[PDB]
Design a protein around this ligand. Structure first.
Ligand SMILES: [Mg+2]
Lengths: 101, 1328, 16, 550, 23, 10
């Protein structure tokens, strides 16, 4: 390309699969922030949410094996997770998470 | 004086009358293309020549053939403007009449069984615009001429720099326009060898044998014979007198010297000489002698005679023996020794050896060898010594026949051998490889013809293949040929050739110089790593043909040249220059164009030669040149004179004032630098010029020139309508001309192309007058820069080196502010997930950024946009994306989730702020047109109809004015005509046949007018409404044009016309710059230190002359402000124009009062002066101009420091200099990057501003860091900044965390290295 | 004759 | 094999070579099942070998295989080797992040350790540092908050940028990097604009002139790199040339011209014979217009000598000097003799001043002295008002008579040649000799007329004085120009060489003041082109030599 | 290979490795 | 004498 023997089309091809370092820093910061918010919880609902969403864990889990933790009951797990969710939605402990929108 | 020139007459300081006006500057392009395209009834040029060179197409069997009849060019689908808008090539269809003639097999060969005439489409031929440019793919391009070697024979030598001894070795090389090369060399053993297409050397007797030359015939051709007889039992020398002039000489009456002048004894003349037997021992036989009784060959040709051989022929009865001539000085045995080393003894062996060297490793057969040698040089299909090549060949060998031949023969080869042997002997000289009669110019017509012929041959192969089948009953001529290879060839040449270049469009001078550029590179030319010093030098034959100043400074020096001012190309492609004849000692008006070969013979005088009132020379001995050497020659021996003082230099060098006071280096720089100037908001004439500006401005095509004279009926910033005179009107014409002006159109270099009217409504205009001024034009004069007040002094280090100190008033007055127009394109394509949509519904973007877009999602016209603003909104469908669990949680908490589409919209680039001046929408045929595209279509149609109706109105006014003139030849009252309503004129009833016939005629004419107007508008609507031919997969394209005003600032590059360039260092406040006694400050301060060492003195002279010119302008301004009488204004103007003993006679007495007012008004800002190159204003004239304006004769004033008020200790040179703003702007060169894109394979940062790339830390930088000892900085550059993928992310995180520490790893490039070395089957690995 | 001489010297060329 | 914009695909030639190898291998395997003539199998094996050698190294075996676009396919050896190879293009040199580039202007107000950096360039280069500081001092909650604040270009972003660049050195580079002084570390000063401001005294190290030159800026990240920049690569440390040991920061051009003008000596200047208490009163007399810069006065000088052993001896005396010499002494550091200033100061004298200051005082005093020297030189070169005019090029009247004599003698020797007394070669040689002698004599006459003037002294007679011609002052000070250039301007251009090397007999009898005619300009171009092309080729030759040495 | 050059500031580092390979 | 497989094959 151009009147140059030192120019080729293959020197202008990007690597679109890469992740920007800004996004990596955002991922790490979000990890720290959600760790703090979950540590601002009672342990049982925090662990229930970790199991239900897969935080710090290899696999995600549904209501069944989350119940299999202590008591195998579905609706109690759902109600616990919903209580934890509206508790986190409280404007007092969510400003650090709202900044990630 | 024309009206345009009368408005502002430039004072001419030249003293030598100009006898030949400069020719049209773009002739080299238009003439060549006219040769290519125009019909040639004799068939030596262009499409006709190519068609006759390929056709008729003969089938191998002989069943039928295809013959060419005629060709024509159709009408273009589009004109130049809409070809530029849509992005299609401006071209014409090629239609050729071909006849398929089918012969009769039963009848004798040559019987016309059947004929079939038909017209066939043979491709699309691009056309030249009136300005010498092509429009390819919507872009203006120029195809530059090529300087190559003329076909024919060249005789050269190694100059004794190859062998250990000197032994100058001579060679001959024949090169055709098309075909194989042939070489004939001499070795250090004095034997002549042949090369065919630069392969293994051969004895060079093979070719003569191939043509059928016996050894005796070769010896006869290449040597003279000396005879011997046996007369009265004595040896008998047939004496040639010239030969004699070591033994006892016969002719006892006139005994010569014995074993120890010649002319005195040879005067009497005898034919009997006796020589000893030993004189035969050294000779070599010249014939083959046979004995019938023995039946054997006693002695062979080219064999040394011995005593036993002498006895053998003595018994054989032969008495006459002829042998070859051989000397050491004048004649040589070279061909005989050549024959000795030759192993071939017959023609068949000759063809066998030629085949083996041609095609090694192939079984040689007689028929194949014969076909190979016939096709090498004696076949019209594979060899063509063209007309120019044929004439050069004939002139080289001195052959006066076979002018129309195209192939070699026995005569040609043998004369080549004879000339090469002669040059070895000493008679004759080698050829000069740089001499301009040996190098040829090849222009756009020739290479277009060549590529067309290539495509034609490509068609002809398949046509011959098809015709050979036989089944031809239902075939038409249009079913046999293949137009796509021809189109491919022409579009290859016009789109991908090295010589087909993007048009240089900074200013008119750049255009003109690009069109007049000759390149030695390209196909069939030189390569830059294989071109030595000799080709780059200025040959003595460049005088008047190639400019010795204008050439690129860099690797391309000497390889790209500029045509001289009066240079021309003859009918054979060789440059020629005009000269004035000298007859009877007087230098006449008659001119003659001489080439390089012709120029050497005569003695040519210079334009500086003093002349008398009678037309002859004054001095007894005049300075002239002959055979390339300058000297003093008698007046009576001079045969020619130069026509102009700028005959040697190019146009750009011709635009440099006081060029003779500048060193060639800085003149080179100034000529190169004038073409980089960017046009400004307001165009200002150069106060000090050369008188060439009008020619460049008019011939560049940027201005609007009047095709016919008349009175300007209507003027507006986009239109000029002129009413043509009665005397120059074509019968039955409208009588009015319309000029539509280009307004704020982007150029190829993202500059502004604007045409501003320079006329008044009612102003009389003649043919050739300038009506509108294009970019860098002022009243028909080229205006590349601005006139700036200049002081030569140092100022506190701010003009250190080449730095320039600029006042704030320069920025306030917007003197160097430029308009840059930029194109931004958003393309909505079709993807796998779906169709990209242009819409205003952009996710994650508020109404703050949607203010400037309309409903369709496109910004409005006139929207002031800044960096990051959305121009056209586009959304692209996206697939499923894996959400990280700690973002699924965030989705759970706050339920917002809108990621169906991704925002890929067109945005303004960073640090770019401007106004949207135009938006165009192109939609594929079959895609819905959104509201904005419909609005553009409606406005386009409305403007088209408005313009068409406006034309109809104005041309009907002109036509009815002509009809009224016809009626007024008798004269009546038109009030009665106006009493009846205009339309009601068609409702009148006439009973008389004389009146009724006229009524019917008028009705029919009105109907025809309506019909033609309807047809024109229907065609225009068809052109507007048709869908675009968008690329496959493309649904829509939107183009936005951004106009940016760029003001001068530090870092920008400024320059004059004398090679004095610099970078602005500071924008000084007005109160800090030096000022004179009247309180007027300077505008720019330049460093004097840069003048003496660079020897560019024309700038000081320009400064002084500009000071004088501005002083005279100030005097005129004063004399106008005080409302002084016209008599004194006229007196002052006449005094100004009478200064110096110049060739200009301007008589103000012949100018009207209004003309004098206009001229004085146009001289308010200074008096323009012309100082032609090598005919410029002397020091005395400059000083006299200074005294006229009441300015110091030294050009130096007393200046005061604005910071202190204290006068400087010495006078300072203050004047006016023409400065230019070069297209090297700090806005386009400032770049910075922290982290961005990376390469796909090497994983390294990209390169360039467009890619937001990074700077390259090359090998020398690494050496510098190693020399310092900075190991850690070097490791940072190698690993964590370029290609350590994990390390660079870790570094970014650490910097964000404020840690400033790195964990270096292995670069990815080394891993790639290892992988490739392993792919080469080599085990490379790392040990622990 | 200055740069070619140095280049020829550092490569330890044989004189002709 | 990647999708380009517009739907097109881009591939590497290795794909084509591998495809050929696989196709021929599969064909050979097929031909050994459908049992075939030995000739066919032999040909297929030949194909396989040719394809493998083409893949490994194209062009070595014979005709190089080309693609559909008619140029040879690039093999693995081509990936590995060459100027474009991986070793030299991507391993020994790389494109780097945190780098920028811009045009360079001149900063005369800068110190030797400072460089002017544009604000936008600093914002782009130091972006992670700005994000870090905004997060640390609390105005940015997350990293997108910091990114938005930087993009919006708020004021606090500018204060943060000042604090990050406060003492972070940057590396400036100019190509070609012929030696290690082509990259140096500077402390950045944020400036409004888009051009880098460069200290004049370092230009000689960079070979940098302000005619469009561009420089690259690099940001060292880690602490080790910063300390290497501050200690090793910083401009104040590199003031001696490693090739010879001489100072490389010697002043040039306007600095030299100003120091020369201020130290010159004029006869019967205003305030001659005055007695001054010291440099301060010389300054006071100059500022009050009592005395000129070039007045011969007597001044009380207190001078301190530092000996080799370190002895410091201070003593005061009255010295016959010039006002400018004392005013310049005001900035000379203690420890140096006054004889170094009591003379007209050319380039050599200023270089000697700096070298002596480094030899007897050290480094810090040397850099302060260099900065003050450059400031003073600029100031007084601005105050001098030195300018070039057409009247400064005085053509000696002896030139015309000398040309006439040479032409007459050339006519005489032409007559002698026509008589056969002398041959053609002798005639050529002695004509060359006579024109060379004429050129030398014209140059000598022009120098003698240009270098002197006659003035009226206090007692009233006429005295000989060195000239104050602008061109003469330019040449003699060593700022710009040498005797050859003044000879070309106001004397004779001399003999010029034909492109082959021969020297034309008739010279150019014109200088650049009256101007050359067409043929003289043509002969000038003959040599100008040769010079330019020789420079172009010699640059590459020298680069290859330097590479080989490295 | 992206390592510290055995010259200047990196010199000491390499010397340390030359000790470690010695032991 | 030749290296091209074409000619050897012929
Ligand atoms: Mg430069």
């Amino acid at each position: 390309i151009g009147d140059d023997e030192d120019s080729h089309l293959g020197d202008f091809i990007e690597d679109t699969t890469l992740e920007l370092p800004l996004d990596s820093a955002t991922a790490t910061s979000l990890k720290a922030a959600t760790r703090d918010v979950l540590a601002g919880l009672t342990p049982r609902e925090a662990k229930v949410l970790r199991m239900r969403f897969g935080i710090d864990m290899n696999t995600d889990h549904t209501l069944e094996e989350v119940g299999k933790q202590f008591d195998v009951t579905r609706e109690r797990i759902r109600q616990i997770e919903a209580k934890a969710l509206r508790k986190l939605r409280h404007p007092s402990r969510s400003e650090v998470l709202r900044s990630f929108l | 004086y024309s009206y345009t020139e009368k408005k502002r007459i430039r004072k001419d300081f030249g003293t030598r009358p100009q006898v030949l006006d400069i020719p049209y500057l773009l002739s080299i392009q238009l003439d060549s293309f006219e040769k290519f395209i125009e019909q040639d009834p004799e068939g030596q040029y262009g499409l006709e020549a190519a068609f006759r060179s390929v056709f008729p197409i003969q089938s191998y069997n002989g069943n039928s053939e295809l013959q060419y009849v005629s060709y024509r060019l159709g009408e273009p689908v589009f004109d130049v403007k809409e070809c530029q808008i849509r992005g299609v090539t401006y071209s014409k269809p090629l239609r050729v009449k071909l006849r398929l003639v089918i012969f009769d097999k039963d009848a004798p060969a040559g019987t016309v069984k059947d004929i079939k005439e038909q017209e066939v489409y043979m491709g699309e031929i691009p056309l030249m615009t009136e300005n010498g440019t092509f429009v390819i793919n919507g872009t203006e391009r120029v195809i530059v001429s090529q300087l190559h070697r003329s076909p024919g024979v060249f005789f050269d030598s190694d100059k004794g720099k190859t062998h250990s001894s000197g032994k100058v070795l001579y060679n001959a090389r024949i090169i055709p326009y098309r075909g194989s090369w042939l070489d004939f060399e001499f070795d250090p053993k004095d034997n002549l060898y042949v090369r065919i297409d630069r392969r293994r050397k051969l004895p060079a007797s093979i070719i003569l044998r191939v043509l059928g030359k016996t050894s005796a015939e070769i010896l006869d051709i290449f040597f003279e014979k000396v005879n011997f007889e046996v007369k009265d039992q004595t040896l008998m020398m047939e004496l040639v007198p010239e030969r004699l002039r070591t033994f006892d000489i016969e002719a006892d009456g006139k005994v010569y010297v014995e074993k120890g002048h010649i002319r005195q004894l040879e005067k009497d003349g005898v034919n009997f000489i006796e020589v000893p037997v030993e004189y035969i021992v050294g000779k070599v036989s010249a014939k083959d002698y046979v004995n019938e009784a023995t039946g054997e060959l006693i002695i062979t040709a080219n064999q040394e005679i011995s005593l036993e051989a002498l006895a053998n022929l003595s018994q054989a009865g032969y008495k006459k023996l002829e042998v070859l001539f051989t000397n050491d000085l004048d004649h040589g045995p070279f061909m005989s020794e050549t024959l000795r080393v030759d192993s071939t003894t017959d023609r068949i062996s000759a063809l066998v050896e030629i085949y083996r060297m041609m095609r090694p490793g192939e079984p040689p057969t007689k028929e194949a060898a014969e076909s190979l040698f016939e096709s090498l040089f004696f076949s019209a299909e594979r060899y063509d010594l063209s007309t120019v090549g044929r004439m050069k060949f004939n002139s080289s060998i001195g052959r006066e026949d076979a002018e129309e031949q195209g192939t070699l023969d026995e005569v040609d080869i043998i004369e080549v051998m004879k000339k090469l042997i002669s040059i070895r002997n000493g008679k004759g000289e080698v050829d000069d490889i740089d001499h301009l009669g040996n190098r040829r110019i090849r222009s756009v017509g020739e290479m277009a013809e060549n590529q067309f012929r290539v495509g034609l041959v490509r068609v002809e192969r398949a046509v011959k293949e098809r015709l050979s089948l036989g089944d031809l009953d239902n075939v038409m001529p249009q079913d046999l040929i293949n137009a796509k290879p021809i189109s491919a060839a022409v579009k290859e040449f016009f789109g991908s050739s090295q010589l087909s270049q993007f048009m240089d469009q900074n200013n008119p001078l750049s255009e003109v110089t690009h069109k007049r550029r000759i390149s030695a590179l390209g196909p069939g030319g030189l390569t830059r790593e294989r071109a030595g010093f000799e080709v780059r030098d200025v040959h003595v034959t460049h005088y008047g043909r190639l400019c010795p100043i204008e050439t690129p400074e860099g690797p391309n020096i000497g390889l790209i040249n500029s045509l001289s001012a009066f240079a021309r190309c003859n009918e054979y492609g060789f440059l020629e220059t005009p000269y004035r004849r000298v007859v009877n000692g007087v230098v006449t008006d008659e001119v003659d164009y001489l080439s390089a070969i012709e120029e050497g013979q005569f003695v040519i005088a210079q334009a500086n030669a003093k002349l008398t009132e009678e037309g002859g020379f004054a001095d007894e001995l005049v300075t002239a040149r002959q055979k390339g050497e300058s000297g003093l020659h008698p007046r009576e021996h001079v045969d020619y004179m130069d026509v102009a003082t700028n005959q040697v230099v190019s146009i750009a060098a011709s635009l440099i004032p006081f060029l003779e006071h500048d060193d060639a280096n800085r003149a080179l720089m100034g000529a190169n630098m004038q073409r980089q100037a960017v046009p400004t908001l307001r165009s200002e004439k150069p106060l000090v010029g050369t008188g060439i500006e009008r020619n460049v401005a008019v011939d560049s095509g940027v201005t609007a020139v009047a095709k016919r004279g008349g009175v300007i009926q209507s003027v507006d910033a986009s239109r000029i309508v002129v009413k043509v005179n009665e005397e120059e009107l074509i019968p039955g014409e409208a009588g009015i001309d319309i000029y539509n002006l280009t307004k704020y159109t982007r150029s190829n270099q993202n500059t502004c192309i604007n045409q501003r009217p320079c006329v008044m409504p009612g102003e009389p205009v003649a043919r050739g007058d300038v009506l509108a001024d294009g970019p860098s034009t002022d009243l028909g004069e080229l205006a590349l820069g601005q006139n700036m007040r200049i002081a030569f002094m140092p100022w506190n280090g701010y003009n250190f080196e080449d730095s320039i100190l600029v006042s704030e008033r320069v920025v306030q007055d917007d003197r160097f502010t430029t308009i840059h127009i930029q194109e931004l394109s958003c393309v909505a394509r079709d993807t796998k997930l779906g169709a990209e949509e242009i819409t205003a519904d952009i996710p994650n973007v508020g109404e703050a950024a949607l203010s400037k877009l309309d409903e369709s999602g496109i910004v409005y016209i006139g929207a002031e946009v800044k960096g990051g603003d959305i121009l056209v909104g586009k959304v692209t469908p996206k697939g499923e994306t894996q959400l990280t669990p700690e973002e699924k949680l965030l989705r759970a908490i706050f339920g917002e989730k809108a990621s169906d589409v991704k925002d890929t919209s067109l945005r303004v680039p960073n640090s770019v702020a401007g106004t949207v001046i135009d938006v165009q929408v192109f939609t594929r045929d079959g895609v819905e047109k959104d509201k904005r595209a419909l609005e553009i279509e409606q406005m386009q149609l409305k403007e088209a109809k408005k313009d068409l109706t406006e034309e109809f109105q104005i041309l009907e006014g002109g036509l009815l004015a002509r009809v009224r003139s016809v009626l007024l030849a008798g004269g009546y009252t038109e009030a009665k005509l106006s009493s009846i309503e205009r339309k009601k004129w068609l409702e009148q009833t006439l009973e008389n046949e004389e009146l009724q016939n006229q009524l019917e005629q008028l009705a029919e004419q009105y109907d025809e007018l309506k019909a033609d107007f309807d047809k024109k508008f229907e065609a225009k609507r068809r052109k507007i409404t048709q869908g675009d031919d968008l690329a496959p997969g493309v649904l829509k394209i939107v183009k936005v044009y951004l106009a940016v005003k760029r003001r001068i600032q530090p870092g920008d590059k400024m320059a004059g016309r004398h090679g004095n360039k610099g970078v602005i260092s500071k924008i000084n406040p007005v109160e800090d710059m030096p000022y004179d006694e009247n309180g007027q400050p300077v505008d720019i301060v330049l460093n004097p230190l840069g003048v003496p060492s660079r020897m560019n003195i024309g700038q000081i002279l320009e400064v002084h002359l500009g000071l004088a010119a501005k002083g005279i302008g100030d005097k005129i301004n004063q004399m106008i402000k005080e409302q002084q009488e016209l008599a004194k204004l006229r007196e002052f103007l006449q005094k100004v124009y009478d200064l110096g003993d110049t060739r200009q006679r301007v008589d103000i007495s012949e100018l009207s009062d209004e003309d004098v007012r206009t001229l004085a008004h146009n001289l308010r800002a200074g008096l323009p002066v012309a100082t032609p190159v090598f005919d410029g204003a002397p020091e005395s004239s400059i000083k006299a101009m200074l005294e006229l304006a009441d300015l110091p004769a030294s050009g130096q004033l007393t200046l005061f420091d604005g910071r202190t008020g204290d006068a400087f200790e010495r006078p300072v040179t203050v004047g006016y200099m023409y400065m230019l703003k070069l297209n090297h702007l700090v806005d386009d060169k400032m770049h910075a990057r922290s982290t961005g894109s990376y390469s796909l394979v090497t994983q390294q940062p990209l390169g360039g501003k467009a890619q937001f790339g990074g700077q390259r830390f090359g090998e020398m930088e690494v050496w510098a860091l190693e020399a310092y000892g900075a190991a850690y900085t070097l490791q940072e550059m190698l690993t964590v900044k370029s290609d350590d993928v994990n390390g660079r992310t870790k570094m970014y995180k650490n910097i964000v965390d404020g840690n400033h520490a790195m964990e270096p790893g292995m670069p990815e490039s080394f891993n790639v290295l290892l992988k490739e070395i392993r792919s080469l089957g080599i085990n490379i690995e790392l040990e622990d | 004759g200055g740069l070619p001489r140095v280049a020829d010297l550092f490569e330890a060329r044989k004189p002709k | 094999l990647v999708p380009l914009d517009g739907g097109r695909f881009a591939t590497s030639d290795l794909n084509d070579l591998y495809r050929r190898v696989i196709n021929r291998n599969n064909r050979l395997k097929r031909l050994l099942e459908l049992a075939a003539p030995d000739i066919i199998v032999r040909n297929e094996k030949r194909m396989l070998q040719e394809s493998v050698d083409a893949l490994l190294d194209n062009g070595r075996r014979g005709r190089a295989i080309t693609g559909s676009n008619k140029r040879p396919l690039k093999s693995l050896a081509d990936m590995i080797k060459g100027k474009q190879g991986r070793f030299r293009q991507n391993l020994l040199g790389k494109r780097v992040d945190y780098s920028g580039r811009s045009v360079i202007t001149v900063g005369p107000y800068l110190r030797l350790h400072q460089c002017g950096l544009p604000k936008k360039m600093a914002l782009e280069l130091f972006k992670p540092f700005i994000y870090s500081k905004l997060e640390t001092r609390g105005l940015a909650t997350t990293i997108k908050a910091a990114k938005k604040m930087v993009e919006r270009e708020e004021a606090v972003v500018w204060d943060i940028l000042d604090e990050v660049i406060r003492e972070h050195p940057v590396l400036l580079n100019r190509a070609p990097t012929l030696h290690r002084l082509g990259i140096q570390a500077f402390e950045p000063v944020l400036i409004e604009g888009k051009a880098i401001q460069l200290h004049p005294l370092v230009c000689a190290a960079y070979n940098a002139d302000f005619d469009g030159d561009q420089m690259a800026v690099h940001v060292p990240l880690t602490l080790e790199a910063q300390l290497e920049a501050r200690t090793l690569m910083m401009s104040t440390n590199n003031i001696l040339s490693p090739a010879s040991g001489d100072p490389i920061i010697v002043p040039s051009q306007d600095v030299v011209l100003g120091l020369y003008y201020m130290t010159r000596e004029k006869i019967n200047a205003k305030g001659e014979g005055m007695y001054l208490t010291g440099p301060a009163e010389a300054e006071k007399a100059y500022r009050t217009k009592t005395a000129e810069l070039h007045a011969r006065v007597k001044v009380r000088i207190t001078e301190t000598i530092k000996h080799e052993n370190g002895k410091l001896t201070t003593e005061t005396k009255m010295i016959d000097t010039t006002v400018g010499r004392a005013m310049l002494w005001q900035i000379v550091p203690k420890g140096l003799p006054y004889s170094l200033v009591n003379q007209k100061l050319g380039k050599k004298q200023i270089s000697n001043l700096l070298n002596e200051a480094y030899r007897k005082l050290g480094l810090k005093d040397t850099v302060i002295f260099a900065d003050q020297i450059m400031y003073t030189g600029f100031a007084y070169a601005a105050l001098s008002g030195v300018s070039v005019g057409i009247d400064d090029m005085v053509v000696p009247a002896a030139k015309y008579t000398e040309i006439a004599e040479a032409e007459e003698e050339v006519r005489e020797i032409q007559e002698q040649f026509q008589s056969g007394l002398v041959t053609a070669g002798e005639r050529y040689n002695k004509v060359i000799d006579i024109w060379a002698s004429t050129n030398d004599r014209v140059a000598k006459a022009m120098m003698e007329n240009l270098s002197s003037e006659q003035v009226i002294n206090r007692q009233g007679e006429q005295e000989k004085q060195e000239s104050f011609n602008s061109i003469y002052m330019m040449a003699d000070s060593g700022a710009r120009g040498s005797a050859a250039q003044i000879r070309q301007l106001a004397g004779m251009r001399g003999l010029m060489a034909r492109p082959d090397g021969s020297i034309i007999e008739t010279p150019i009898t014109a200088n650049f003041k009256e101007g050359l005619n067409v043929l003289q300009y043509f002969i000038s171009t003959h040599g100008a082109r040769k010079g330019l092309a020789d420079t172009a080729l010699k640059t590459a030759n020298s680069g290859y030599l330097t590479r080989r040495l490295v | 290979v992206g390592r510290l050059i055995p010259a200047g500031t990196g010199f000491a580092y390499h010397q340390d490795r030359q000790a470690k390979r010695a032991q | 004498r030749t290296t091209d497989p074409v000619r050897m094959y012929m």
